[PDB]
Design a protein around this ligand. Structure first.
Ligand SMILES: C[C@@H](NC(=O)C1C=CC=NC1=O)C1CC1
Ligand SMILES: C[C@@H](NC(=O)C1C=CC=NC1=O)C1CC1
Length: 150
């Protein structure tokens, strides 16, 4: 009973979380997941400021109200070569990665590793935070409050 959560650097508090190496998070799961990191789904304004500090990914993830990809450099296979906060307009499907916003993070680029999941609750799952540099932090718990996400 295991969940891997791959996380990035934080940029003005915003970071990306990919679960189990594939698009697998619903909107309800995303809010609960960010809550376990003492975080929330970013607003569009918080995501635009994170972009301006150096944040970009090549993966769709929830923010408040939309599913987006922040892009700095144009790449043909990432958000159809767009730059800026690219908003997903048309999709048949409901599961993506998520972004999260932690208000206590540093104001600009924070590429230190994540070593805590401070607000997870009691549960049976081995949850492992995987940083980009491979360092890991694991704890037994749960973060999903909606049964349909379990
Ligand atoms: C939840 C937050 N991490 C932390 O607050 C700590 C605190 C102490 C030690 N390690 C952490 O990752 C993640 C968003 C960045
Ligand atoms: C407690 C410890 N770590 C942190 O505060 C954080 C916060 C966010 C992300 N990673 C951390 O290690 C301080 C010594 C460095």
């Amino acid at each position: 009973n295991q969940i891997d959560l791959n996380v990035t650097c934080r940029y003005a508090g915003v970071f990306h979380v990919e679960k189990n190496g594939r698009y697998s998070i619903s909107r309800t799961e995303a809010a609960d997941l960010c809550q376990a990191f003492n975080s929330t789904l970013p607003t569009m304004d918080q995501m635009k400021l994170a972009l301006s500090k150096g944040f970009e990914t090549c993966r769709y993830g929830f923010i408040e109200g939309n599913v987006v990809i922040p892009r700095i450099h144009p790449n043909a296979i990432c958000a159809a070569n767009h730059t800026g906060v690219y908003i997903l307009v048309t999709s048949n499907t409901s599961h993506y990665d998520t972004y999260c916003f932690n208000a206590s993070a540093p104001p600009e680029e924070d590429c230190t590793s994540v070593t805590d999941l401070p607000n997870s609750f009691d549960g049976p799952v081995t949850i492992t935070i995987v940083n980009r540099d491979g360092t890991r932090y694991s704890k037994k718990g749960e973060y999903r409050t909606h049964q349909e996400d379990i």
